[PDB]
Amino acid sequence: MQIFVKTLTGKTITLEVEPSDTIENVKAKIQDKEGIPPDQQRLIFAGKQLEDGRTLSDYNIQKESTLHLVLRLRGG
Amino acid sequence: SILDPEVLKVAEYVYQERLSKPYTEVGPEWEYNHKTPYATRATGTGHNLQRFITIDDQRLHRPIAGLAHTMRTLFYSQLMYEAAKRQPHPHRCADGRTIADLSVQDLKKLNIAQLFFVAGRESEASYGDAYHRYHLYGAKQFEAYARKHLTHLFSEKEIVLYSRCIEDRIGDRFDETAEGYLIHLSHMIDLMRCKSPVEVFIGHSRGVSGIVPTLIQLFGREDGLDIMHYARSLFAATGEAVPYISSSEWPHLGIESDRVERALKIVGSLEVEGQEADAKKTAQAGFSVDGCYGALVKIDTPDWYHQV
């Protein structure tokens, strides 16, 4: 499915994912597309933070869902 | 918008001993996996998150819990002091005082305490066990320094007091004291730099209001949104990525439209664009107290703010 990844400033991408896809898996995907290292990404959905072991289906994340990325500095 | 030189001298020592120093609870031994929860020294996520960034091949350690975050809260506690005084009936804490009752001396003591609030971090780890351990370290770092150099300013009752605030004990109220209330409310504003609009405007549960609703409920919509725009100007001044705001997007963030409409009746409409992080401003803020302080004093406080 598609899910939206927005920085707090508002720069947005989509990803093609599957609901049982770990956040570590999706952080690896966000690096493949954008060059942002996993541990420079703090991910948030429905006002909770997202965890590396858990799945999208453990947060109820469905098609065209917006997650929120906290990025301090591009290239930092 | 002016801080006592004895406050900045305490922030000089803190930056050298704690905020400059790397994150030491990190690496493989502090990784976490729920599935194997006690296969590591970590009992929860977050130990390896944003440990440093690189500006001109220089490390900016604990960037999100660093010098710019720590010193921005002092300006917020100095603004809310006047904001509280404008209220007929400011919130009255468990000790029986309001922030408005605080004198100019207590605020200088409260500013010195705010410096060690997150200074005891060893990582971005956020689970209560890491959070309460790190707050305990910052508290003991305060106690030692305060007992040794600041007896001319603090009484032994006040070190006990301010250490208890920084600790944020399990079984102490939010506003248990008018100093700790304000220290929390200062810490809180600055969360705007790392939180989704939900936790900022909707609140992260049905109970909890949301950061800006808190500023509006306590200080009024006018004073309450002045305080928010100033927090976001101070983000800009310290090279932080200023978030955008959009009341049109709140319905599509996976919440029940009760808590959106509640936030919409309270916040009102807010549309306002975000601004992108600057390596140069961030580094100026992050690597010296002089550069942090200088970058932040330049920024206009609202029209009603007149320091005593």
Residue numbers in the entry:
A (entry chain B): 1 to 76
B (entry chain A): 3 to 310
Passage from the reporting paper:
Here, we describe identification of two bacterial effectors that reverse PR ubiquitination and are thus named deubiquitinases for PR ubiquitination (DUPs; DupA and DupB). Structural analyses revealed that DupA and SidE ubiquitin ligases harbor a highly homologous catalytic phosphodiesterase (PDE) domain. However, unlike SidE ubiquitin ligases, DupA displays increased affinity to PR-ubiquitinated substrates, which allows DupA to cleave PR ubiquitin from substrates.
To reveal the atomic basis underlying the bias of DupA toward deubiquitinase activity, we sought to determine the structure of enzymatically inactive DupA (H67A) in complex with a PR-ubiquitinated substrate. A Rtn4 peptide, acting as a minimal ubiquitination substrate of SdeA (Kalayil et al., 2018), was modified to harbor only one target serine residue. In particular, DupA/B-Ub structures displayed a closed conformation with Ub due to extensive electrostatic interactions, while the SidE PDE domain lacked the corresponding residues. Additionally, DupA H67A effectively interacted with Ub, ADPR-Ub, and PR-ubiquitinated substrates, whereas the SdeA PDE domain H277A only co-precipitated unmodified Ub. Accordingly, DupA displayed a strong binding affinity and high kon to Ub, ADPR-Ub, and PR-ubiquitinated peptides, while the SdeA PDE domain showed weak affinity to Ub and ADPR-Ub. Moreover, the SdeA PDE domain did not bind to the PR-ubiquitinated serine peptide, whereas DupA maintained a strong binding affinity. Only the DupA E242R mutant affected the hydrolase ability and displayed reduced binding affinity to PR-ubiquitinated substrates. More importantly, the same mutant was now able to promote stable PR ubiquitination. These data reveal that the extent of interaction between PDE domains and Ub governs the directionality of their enzymatic activity.
